[PDB]
Ligand binder design. Structure first.
Ligand SMILES: [Mg+2]
Lengths: 75, 334
């Protein structure tokens, strides 16, 4: 989390390490948890509720719709 | 003694892509660069003969260099020098090293250490060539060095000898071993015949043990002719002829053998006697005829190589006179 955590970062310089880093140790391989066999990542907090608010049917104002300009702005 | 020895090594291939474009040629060139001119694994390696086995050009695992190594098994021409071996040409390098040091200028690079305690040296100044007898101290082939290291004395014909008492017969396999050995002695004898004869006569008289043997009497070309001189005592035999007829499986060797100093050392002659008629200062040695023939044959090998290299290096009378302090010295100690 971002409460004061510090994490190490080193940039490979060797060609063998650089080839290895992008092909084998890229984070795309850790999307599925080896421990649980399920996904690791997803929406957290601001987006889990944001996905619900975006996709819910009725807002307190009315139906959950937006005009073209604001639908474009989502992208 | 030059010979062929099979080696094993692992190379380092800095450019495996360019190396594999011609594996055998590049492998041979790398082996020649690495091992020729340097003693490696108790042998000197004079020339690299083609490889016998090799590994696939692997890739270095424990580093990110990307280089390969590949293991190689190869055979090479190696010069191995033994005890009691005869070297005919040694150049003195420095007299400030009072222990006296020399450098052989033959086909087998050796740096000799002639001790100065004996008075037969310290008379040879720097720049002159004088032969050396290798003592019973083993030649040290320290790996990676450009030449062998050994200690040896200036050759005096050493009027001592050994009698050999045989109690075992030769087998056909041992017969083939000594027939290869006599092939070597035939090559040496042909080389001897190819030289200017008078120089071999002079050097053979100089290094003959017992007396000056009178005069030029009894020509000694030896090659295919069992001619000889002096004729001190007892009827001699041709060890070569004994070998070929033993290859035909006629003669037994169950007897006493010797090459006393009265014989001409480079000659293939020796005495086979049944009950030890020799004037030996040593007890007869009880062992098989393979040992006897091996020892006598290689004795002939080194004596004949000694005289051949002495005749070859001394092509002119001026060089002999330039080293005059050795010839009268050895004539003194006959
Ligand atoms: Mg934290």
């Amino acid at each position: 989390d971002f409460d004061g955590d510090q994490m190490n970062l080193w940039v490979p310089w060797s060609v063998m390490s650089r080839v290895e880093a992008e092909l084998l140790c890229s984070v795309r391989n850790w999307f599925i948890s080896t421990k649980s066999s399920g996904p690791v990542n997803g929406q957290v907090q601001d987006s889990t509720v944001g996905s619900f608010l975006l996709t819910r049917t009725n807002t307190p104002m009315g139906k959950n719709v937006m005009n073209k300009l604001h639908a474009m702005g989502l992208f | 003694m030059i010979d062929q020895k099979i080696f094993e090594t692992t190379l380092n291939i800095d450019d495996p892509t360019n190396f594999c474009t011609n594996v055998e040629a590049h492998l041979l060139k790398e082996l020649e660069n690495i091992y020729v001119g340097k003693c490696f694994k108790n042998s000197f390696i004079l020339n690299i003969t083609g490889v016998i086995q090799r590994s696939p050009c692997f890739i270095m695992r424990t580093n990110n260099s990307g280089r390969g190594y590949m293991h190689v098994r190869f055979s090479a021409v190696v010069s191995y020098l033994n005890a009691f071996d005869l070297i005919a040409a040694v150049k003195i390098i420095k007299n400030d090293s009072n222990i006296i040091l020399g450098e052989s200028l033959l086909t087998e690079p050796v740096t000799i250490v002639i001790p100065s305690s004996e008075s037969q040296n310290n008379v040879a100044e720097v720049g002159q060539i004088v032969p050396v007898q290798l003592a019973n101290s083993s030649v040290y082939y320290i790996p990676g060095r450009q030449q062998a290291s050994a200690t040896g004395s200036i050759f005096i014909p050493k009027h001592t000898f050994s009698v050999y008492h045989v109690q075992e017969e030769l087998t056909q396999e041992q017969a083939l071993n000594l027939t290869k050995l006599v092939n070597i002695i035939e090559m040496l004898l042909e080389s001897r015949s190819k030289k200017d004869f008078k120089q071999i006569c002079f050097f053979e008289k100089l290094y003959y043990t017992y007396s000056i043997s009178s005069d030029e009497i009894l020509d000694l070309k030896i090659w295919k002719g069992p001619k000889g001189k002096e004729m001190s005592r007892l009827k001699p035999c041709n060890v070569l002829s004994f070998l070929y007829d033993a290859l035909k499986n006629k003669n037994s060797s169950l007897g006493f053998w010797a090459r006393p100093p009265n014989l001409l050392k480079s000659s293939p002659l020796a005495y086979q006697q049944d009950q030890n008629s020799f004037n030996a200062t040593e007890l007869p040695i009880i062992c098989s005829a393979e040992v006897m023939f091996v020892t006598l044959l290689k004795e002939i090998i080194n004596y004949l190589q000694f005289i051949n290299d002495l005749c070859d290096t001394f092509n002119n009378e001026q060089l002999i006179k330039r080293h005059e302090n050795i010839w009268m010295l050895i004539e003194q100690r006959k």
